[PDB]
Amino acid sequence: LETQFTCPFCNHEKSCDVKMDRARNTGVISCTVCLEEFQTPITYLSEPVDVYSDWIDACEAANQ
Amino acid sequence: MLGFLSARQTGLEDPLRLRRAESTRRVLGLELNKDRDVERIHGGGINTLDIEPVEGRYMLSGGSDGVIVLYDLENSSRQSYYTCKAVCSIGRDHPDVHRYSVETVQWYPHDTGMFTSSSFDKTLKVWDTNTLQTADVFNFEETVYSHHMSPVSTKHCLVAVGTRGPKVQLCDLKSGSCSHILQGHRQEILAVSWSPRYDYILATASADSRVKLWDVRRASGCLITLDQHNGKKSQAVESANTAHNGKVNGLCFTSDGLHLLTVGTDNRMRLWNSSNGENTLVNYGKVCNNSKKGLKFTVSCGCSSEFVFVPYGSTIAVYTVYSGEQITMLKGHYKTVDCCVFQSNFQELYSGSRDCNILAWVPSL
Amino acid sequence: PVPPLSVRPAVVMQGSARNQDDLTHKLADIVKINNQLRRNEQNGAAAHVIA
Ligand SMILES: [Zn+2]
């Protein structure tokens, strides 16, 4: 499972970094290029793929 | 100021004096707008703004969510408080919406019936403003960081595009020829800007810490390479003659086009003689920027002294171009400011930032 | 360094078909991609294509 992801907003490969703040149960995914940021709740079973998942889902939901 | 009015009435001073002095005074009194608001439609940060060059009424805004919003800035209501309503919108439901962030949007000069928008989806789309449909699309092999149409060209209608490729593309809007490229950079071309003075002069700033001026008619590469030291540290041109000690992510010709303001990721802005690229050694102090993409900043027009409005963190730093003296910080944004566009008719400013807000700064009183 | 022919002999076969050695085939690969890369770096080539 890759940790760096293509940004849904600027389509820059591996430009998204994921930070797991487990102490606060929050994952923050940020694109280095276009500076888009997204915050989602996470669990101890969560992974950066799950945070990027929640980001893609939030984008598609907001774009309806 | 009653002295100014009296001098204008009595012919002591040219009306030019009152006009430019009052423009400068208005710019100095720039403050968060007391009675004005801008409609919020972008779901993501606004990366770019552009007020149309003719009549200065309509404003384009490209968001990080790929939508393009067209606002009317005129207060068509009778109240002193109004919101800049959104006339049109390339929203998520438009068949031609950009799939990724719109990074530059520009009105067609000489006419408001067309505009252009480049995105990180590797497309420069040319839109008919009336039908709001894509009149043309130019696809690129690599993401677009910036683009610019000449604000002066009555003859050519080239769009200079800077992508992550090391080549500056020149897309002819006259019969579509995107094959023309300029060689000489080595990394992503983060900013491009046509000279407002000279028709065929284009300045390009790239991540290789170099700024090059090209005569696009010419067959022999760039005209000038900007050098910080002008020759104090002189070396055979392979890696020397850098404009900055980092990525040069913003360009802006001054109003007359005789100087060039370059902002780079070394936390420095520099002013260059646009005719021979000599550094004028204007200080400006430290200009905080760490943007990994192009940084959009503008200069004032029609004032006694020229000003430059640079995004500075979550603020707008206003500097005097030719002295470097720091005027002020416009402080009303909650995240880093991506773009600021200057309305020259009324000395107004519109700033878009990552907080999904377009804030209007108006002169006080 | 290309080695000489004795390090990579071209052994003849029951007929006339001269079979080359693995090193010779590999030098063929290196040469073709070296020439091809050379013409790309000499010309205009995408930085990722050159890479
Ligand atoms: Zn991004």
- Which of A34, A37, A64 lies nearest to residue B120, judging by beta carbons? A34
Distance CA C14, CA C18 (A): 9
Helix, strand, or coil here: A37?
strand
Distance CA C37, CA C51 (A): 10
Distance CA B115, CA B104 (A): 11
Q: Which amino acid is at B53?
A: P
The distance between the two most distant Cα atoms of chain B, rounded to a whole number of Å, is 64
Inter-chain CB proximity B291 and A35 less than 8 Å: yes
HSE-up of residue B134 (Cα within 13 Å, Cβ side): 15
Q: Which amino acid is at B160?
A: A
Inter-chain CB proximity B141 and C46 less than 8 Å: yes
Taking alpha carbons only, the member of B247, B239, B136, B156 closest to residue B202 is B156
List of chain A residues whose C-beta atoms are within 8 Å of the C-beta of residue B338:
35
The separation between the first and the last C-alpha atoms of chain C, rounded to the nearest angstrom, is: 23
Cα–Cα distances in angstroms (integers) from residue B300 to residues B23, B57, B130, B166, B263, in the given order = 10, 17, 29, 31, 16
B141 inside 8 A of chain C by CB: yes
Inter-chain CB proximity B100 and A63 less than 8 Å: no
Paired tokens of B352: 């878009």
Chain C from 28 to 47: CB within 8 A of any B CB: 44, 46-47
For chain B, counts of helices (H) and of strands (E): 2, 29
List of chain A residues whose C-beta atoms are within 8 Å of the C-beta of residue B121:
11
The separation between the first and the last C-alpha atoms of chain B, rounded to the nearest angstrom, is: 13
CB neighbours of residue A35 within 10 Å = 23
Cα–Cα distances in angstroms (integers) from residue B330 to residues B262, B314, B319, C31, in the given order = 21, 9, 11, 62
Reported structure resolution in angstroms: 3.1
A34 annotated as belonging to a binding site for a ligand: yes
Write down the domain spans for chain B: 1-365
Is residue B304 within 8 Å of residue B252, measured between CB atoms? no
Strand partners, B32: B361
Distance CA B110, CA A10 (A): 30
Specify the experimental method.
Answer: cryo-EM
Kindly tell me the burial class for residue C34, based on how many C-beta atoms sit within 10 Å of its own C-beta (0-12, 13-18, 19 or more).
Answer: exposed
Tell me, yes or no, whether chains C and A touch by having 3 or more C-beta pairs under 8 A: no
